[PDB]
């Protein structure tokens, strides 16, 4: 169980490219578009669990809310991630 951080500057017109799936402790990255952001291509992989987005703990929040927060991303983006086994 590795716990790390991802910080990036989102650019207008370029989506983070992450597809999400509900998880007990946050949002699982079910899929991602390689090449969107180097910070993502470098630190994230499918299966990674985002436990916090821009300082807000995602555990327990409805998946739909987590999705909305993700989609609302603008400017500086910060994520706390957990990578199983």
Tab-separated table of N, CA and C in Angstrom:
chain	number	residue	atom	x	y	z
A	1	UNK	N	0.836	-1.238	0.000
A	1	UNK	CA	0.000	0.000	0.000
A	1	UNK	C	0.858	1.271	0.000
A	2	UNK	N	1.057	1.840	-1.186
A	2	UNK	CA	1.844	3.060	-1.330
A	2	UNK	C	0.907	4.252	-1.367
A	3	UNK	N	1.233	5.277	-0.587
A	3	UNK	CA	0.437	6.496	-0.528
A	3	UNK	C	1.287	7.674	-0.997
A	4	UNK	N	0.859	8.315	-2.083
A	4	UNK	CA	1.601	9.436	-2.641
A	4	UNK	C	0.707	10.585	-3.093
A	5	UNK	N	1.332	11.649	-3.586
A	5	UNK	CA	0.599	12.816	-4.046
A	5	UNK	C	0.831	13.145	-5.504
A	6	UNK	N	-0.175	13.762	-6.111
A	6	UNK	CA	-0.090	14.183	-7.494
A	6	UNK	C	-0.564	15.630	-7.534
A	7	UNK	N	0.269	16.494	-8.101
A	7	UNK	CA	-0.038	17.910	-8.209
A	7	UNK	C	0.251	18.333	-9.633
A	8	UNK	N	-0.699	19.026	-10.247
A	8	UNK	CA	-0.521	19.471	-11.613
A	8	UNK	C	-1.341	20.718	-11.889
A	9	UNK	N	-0.974	21.422	-12.950
A	9	UNK	CA	-1.672	22.625	-13.354
A	9	UNK	C	-2.559	22.219	-14.513
A	10	UNK	N	-3.870	22.288	-14.327
A	10	UNK	CA	-4.753	21.907	-15.413
A	10	UNK	C	-4.825	23.010	-16.458
A	11	UNK	N	-4.809	22.605	-17.724
A	11	UNK	CA	-4.883	23.552	-18.819
A	11	UNK	C	-6.271	23.548	-19.443
A	12	UNK	N	-6.756	24.739	-19.777
A	12	UNK	CA	-8.064	24.889	-20.395
A	12	UNK	C	-8.104	24.068	-21.679
A	13	UNK	N	-9.188	23.329	-21.881
A	13	UNK	CA	-9.306	22.534	-23.091
A	13	UNK	C	-8.690	21.145	-23.042
A	14	UNK	N	-7.882	20.874	-22.023
A	14	UNK	CA	-7.259	19.566	-21.891
A	14	UNK	C	-7.745	18.860	-20.627
A	15	UNK	N	-8.558	17.823	-20.808
A	15	UNK	CA	-9.092	17.061	-19.682
A	15	UNK	C	-7.988	16.245	-19.016
A	16	UNK	N	-8.172	15.933	-17.738
A	16	UNK	CA	-7.195	15.132	-17.012
A	16	UNK	C	-7.097	13.752	-17.673
A	17	UNK	N	-8.201	13.311	-18.276
A	17	UNK	CA	-8.224	12.031	-18.962
A	17	UNK	C	-8.374	10.807	-18.079
A	18	UNK	N	-8.908	11.000	-16.875
A	18	UNK	CA	-9.093	9.905	-15.928
A	18	UNK	C	-10.545	9.454	-15.845
A	19	UNK	N	-10.771	8.149	-15.955
A	19	UNK	CA	-12.113	7.596	-15.833
A	19	UNK	C	-12.165	7.040	-14.417
A	20	UNK	N	-13.262	7.292	-13.713
A	20	UNK	CA	-13.379	6.854	-12.334
A	20	UNK	C	-14.394	5.756	-12.053
A	21	UNK	N	-14.151	5.036	-10.969
A	21	UNK	CA	-15.013	3.967	-10.484
A	21	UNK	C	-15.124	4.116	-8.976
A	22	UNK	N	-16.303	3.839	-8.420
A	22	UNK	CA	-16.504	3.962	-6.977
A	22	UNK	C	-15.655	2.994	-6.173
A	23	UNK	N	-15.178	3.461	-5.029
A	23	UNK	CA	-14.360	2.642	-4.152
A	23	UNK	C	-14.698	2.981	-2.709
A	24	UNK	N	-14.569	1.987	-1.838
A	24	UNK	CA	-14.872	2.147	-0.425
A	24	UNK	C	-14.152	3.328	0.215
A	25	UNK	N	-12.901	3.550	-0.175
A	25	UNK	CA	-12.123	4.634	0.400
A	25	UNK	C	-11.840	5.793	-0.546
A	26	UNK	N	-12.613	5.895	-1.618
A	26	UNK	CA	-12.405	6.986	-2.551
A	26	UNK	C	-12.807	6.644	-3.968
A	27	UNK	N	-12.060	7.173	-4.925
A	27	UNK	CA	-12.340	6.919	-6.327
A	27	UNK	C	-11.219	6.151	-6.981
A	28	UNK	N	-11.567	5.033	-7.602
A	28	UNK	CA	-10.582	4.219	-8.293
A	28	UNK	C	-10.395	4.779	-9.695
A	29	UNK	N	-9.162	4.786	-10.176
A	29	UNK	CA	-8.917	5.255	-11.527
A	29	UNK	C	-9.069	3.999	-12.369
A	30	UNK	N	-10.215	3.876	-13.025
A	30	UNK	CA	-10.487	2.703	-13.844
A	30	UNK	C	-9.797	2.758	-15.197
A	31	UNK	N	-9.479	3.962	-15.648
A	31	UNK	CA	-8.860	4.106	-16.946
A	31	UNK	C	-8.290	5.507	-17.079
A	32	UNK	N	-7.312	5.670	-17.960
A	32	UNK	CA	-6.721	6.984	-18.159
A	32	UNK	C	-6.105	7.136	-19.543
A	33	UNK	N	-6.202	8.343	-20.084
A	33	UNK	CA	-5.662	8.644	-21.399
A	33	UNK	C	-4.199	9.046	-21.253
A	34	UNK	N	-3.301	8.174	-21.690
A	34	UNK	CA	-1.879	8.467	-21.609
A	34	UNK	C	-1.568	9.694	-22.455
A	35	UNK	N	-0.663	10.537	-21.967
A	35	UNK	CA	-0.287	11.721	-22.720
A	35	UNK	C	-0.950	13.040	-22.371
A	36	UNK	N	-1.989	13.025	-21.541
A	36	UNK	CA	-2.652	14.276	-21.176
A	36	UNK	C	-1.716	15.154	-20.349
A	37	UNK	N	-1.284	14.631	-19.206
A	37	UNK	CA	-0.391	15.349	-18.309
A	37	UNK	C	0.771	14.466	-17.867
A	38	UNK	N	2.004	14.989	-17.953
A	38	UNK	CA	3.186	14.213	-17.551
A	38	UNK	C	3.150	13.765	-16.094
A	39	UNK	N	2.561	14.586	-15.230
A	39	UNK	CA	2.458	14.249	-13.814
A	39	UNK	C	1.593	13.004	-13.632
A	40	UNK	N	0.636	12.813	-14.535
A	40	UNK	CA	-0.232	11.643	-14.460
A	40	UNK	C	0.497	10.445	-15.053
A	41	UNK	N	1.033	10.613	-16.257
A	41	UNK	CA	1.745	9.519	-16.904
A	41	UNK	C	2.875	8.992	-16.031
A	42	UNK	N	3.418	9.862	-15.186
A	42	UNK	CA	4.528	9.495	-14.316
A	42	UNK	C	4.158	8.792	-13.020
A	43	UNK	N	3.105	9.260	-12.360
A	43	UNK	CA	2.721	8.698	-11.073
A	43	UNK	C	1.474	7.835	-10.970
A	44	UNK	N	0.556	7.954	-11.921
A	44	UNK	CA	-0.677	7.180	-11.834
A	44	UNK	C	-0.803	5.995	-12.784
A	45	UNK	N	-1.599	5.016	-12.363
A	45	UNK	CA	-1.869	3.826	-13.157
A	45	UNK	C	-3.287	3.409	-12.827
A	46	UNK	N	-3.878	2.575	-13.678
A	46	UNK	CA	-5.223	2.073	-13.432
A	46	UNK	C	-5.176	1.315	-12.118
A	47	UNK	N	-6.253	1.374	-11.348
A	47	UNK	CA	-6.268	0.669	-10.081
A	47	UNK	C	-5.911	1.566	-8.910
A	48	UNK	N	-5.290	2.708	-9.195
A	48	UNK	CA	-4.925	3.642	-8.136
A	48	UNK	C	-6.186	4.230	-7.517
A	49	UNK	N	-6.149	4.468	-6.211
A	49	UNK	CA	-7.300	5.026	-5.521
A	49	UNK	C	-7.031	6.440	-5.030
A	50	UNK	N	-7.846	7.380	-5.494
A	50	UNK	CA	-7.719	8.766	-5.073
A	50	UNK	C	-8.548	8.885	-3.794
A	51	UNK	N	-7.876	9.191	-2.690
A	51	UNK	CA	-8.534	9.295	-1.394
A	51	UNK	C	-8.894	10.721	-1.023
A	52	UNK	N	-8.275	11.678	-1.700
A	52	UNK	CA	-8.541	13.077	-1.418
A	52	UNK	C	-8.310	13.897	-2.680
A	53	UNK	N	-9.198	14.853	-2.932
A	53	UNK	CA	-9.092	15.715	-4.106
A	53	UNK	C	-9.142	17.171	-3.641
A	54	UNK	N	-8.060	17.902	-3.902
A	54	UNK	CA	-7.931	19.299	-3.495
A	54	UNK	C	-8.213	19.493	-2.009
A	55	UNK	N	-7.706	18.569	-1.197
A	55	UNK	CA	-7.887	18.662	0.240
A	55	UNK	C	-9.153	18.054	0.813
A	56	UNK	N	-10.106	17.684	-0.042
A	56	UNK	CA	-11.346	17.089	0.439
A	56	UNK	C	-11.306	15.563	0.437
A	57	UNK	N	-11.527	14.970	1.604
A	57	UNK	CA	-11.524	13.524	1.737
A	57	UNK	C	-12.713	12.982	0.960
A	58	UNK	N	-12.460	12.004	0.094
A	58	UNK	CA	-13.515	11.426	-0.738
A	58	UNK	C	-14.211	10.225	-0.128
A	59	UNK	N	-13.562	9.568	0.829
A	59	UNK	CA	-14.156	8.396	1.463
A	59	UNK	C	-15.520	8.709	2.070
A	60	UNK	N	-16.531	7.933	1.692
A	60	UNK	CA	-17.858	8.156	2.238
A	60	UNK	C	-18.759	9.063	1.425
A	61	UNK	N	-18.177	9.915	0.585
A	61	UNK	CA	-18.972	10.817	-0.248
A	61	UNK	C	-19.595	10.018	-1.384
A	62	UNK	N	-20.794	10.408	-1.841
A	62	UNK	CA	-21.411	9.661	-2.945
A	62	UNK	C	-20.465	9.718	-4.154
A	63	UNK	N	-20.413	8.649	-4.943
A	63	UNK	CA	-19.531	8.628	-6.113
A	63	UNK	C	-19.798	9.811	-7.043
A	64	UNK	N	-21.074	10.131	-7.210
A	64	UNK	CA	-21.518	11.220	-8.062
A	64	UNK	C	-20.931	12.579	-7.651
A	65	UNK	N	-20.734	12.770	-6.350
A	65	UNK	CA	-20.168	14.012	-5.841
A	65	UNK	C	-18.683	14.046	-6.177
A	66	UNK	N	-18.009	12.921	-5.954
A	66	UNK	CA	-16.584	12.803	-6.235
A	66	UNK	C	-16.338	13.099	-7.702
A	67	UNK	N	-17.234	12.597	-8.544
A	67	UNK	CA	-17.134	12.806	-9.977
A	67	UNK	C	-17.274	14.293	-10.277
A	68	UNK	N	-18.307	14.920	-9.713
A	68	UNK	CA	-18.535	16.350	-9.933
A	68	UNK	C	-17.340	17.195	-9.511
A	69	UNK	N	-16.723	16.862	-8.380
A	69	UNK	CA	-15.565	17.626	-7.911
A	69	UNK	C	-14.427	17.473	-8.904
A	70	UNK	N	-14.273	16.256	-9.412
A	70	UNK	CA	-13.220	15.974	-10.364
A	70	UNK	C	-13.427	16.787	-11.625
A	71	UNK	N	-14.650	16.757	-12.136
A	71	UNK	CA	-14.980	17.484	-13.348
A	71	UNK	C	-14.889	18.989	-13.157
A	72	UNK	N	-15.047	19.438	-11.917
A	72	UNK	CA	-14.977	20.862	-11.648
A	72	UNK	C	-13.555	21.379	-11.595
A	73	UNK	N	-12.594	20.462	-11.632
A	73	UNK	CA	-11.170	20.802	-11.582
A	73	UNK	C	-10.796	21.978	-12.475
A	74	UNK	N	-10.097	22.944	-11.893
A	74	UNK	CA	-9.680	24.126	-12.624
A	74	UNK	C	-8.453	24.747	-11.959
A	75	UNK	N	-7.421	25.000	-12.753
A	75	UNK	CA	-6.207	25.575	-12.206
A	75	UNK	C	-5.360	24.509	-11.536
A	76	UNK	N	-4.885	24.800	-10.331
A	76	UNK	CA	-4.057	23.850	-9.607
A	76	UNK	C	-4.903	22.674	-9.136
A	77	UNK	N	-4.414	21.466	-9.393
A	77	UNK	CA	-5.110	20.251	-8.992
A	77	UNK	C	-4.205	19.444	-8.060
A	78	UNK	N	-4.777	18.941	-6.974
A	78	UNK	CA	-4.016	18.157	-6.013
A	78	UNK	C	-4.782	16.904	-5.611
A	79	UNK	N	-4.101	15.761	-5.641
A	79	UNK	CA	-4.723	14.488	-5.283
A	79	UNK	C	-3.855	13.686	-4.324
A	80	UNK	N	-4.500	12.978	-3.400
A	80	UNK	CA	-3.799	12.087	-2.483
A	80	UNK	C	-4.188	10.710	-3.009
A	81	UNK	N	-3.196	9.890	-3.330
A	81	UNK	CA	-3.447	8.579	-3.911
A	81	UNK	C	-2.893	7.383	-3.143
A	82	UNK	N	-3.613	6.264	-3.217
A	82	UNK	CA	-3.191	5.013	-2.585
A	82	UNK	C	-3.126	3.938	-3.665
A	83	UNK	N	-2.005	3.228	-3.742
A	83	UNK	CA	-1.836	2.172	-4.734
A	83	UNK	C	-1.777	0.785	-4.092
A	84	UNK	N	-2.852	-0.007	-4.241
A	84	UNK	CA	-2.914	-1.356	-3.669
A	84	UNK	C	-1.923	-2.367	-4.242
A	85	UNK	N	-1.346	-3.154	-3.332
A	85	UNK	CA	-0.363	-4.201	-3.624
A	85	UNK	C	0.566	-3.877	-4.776
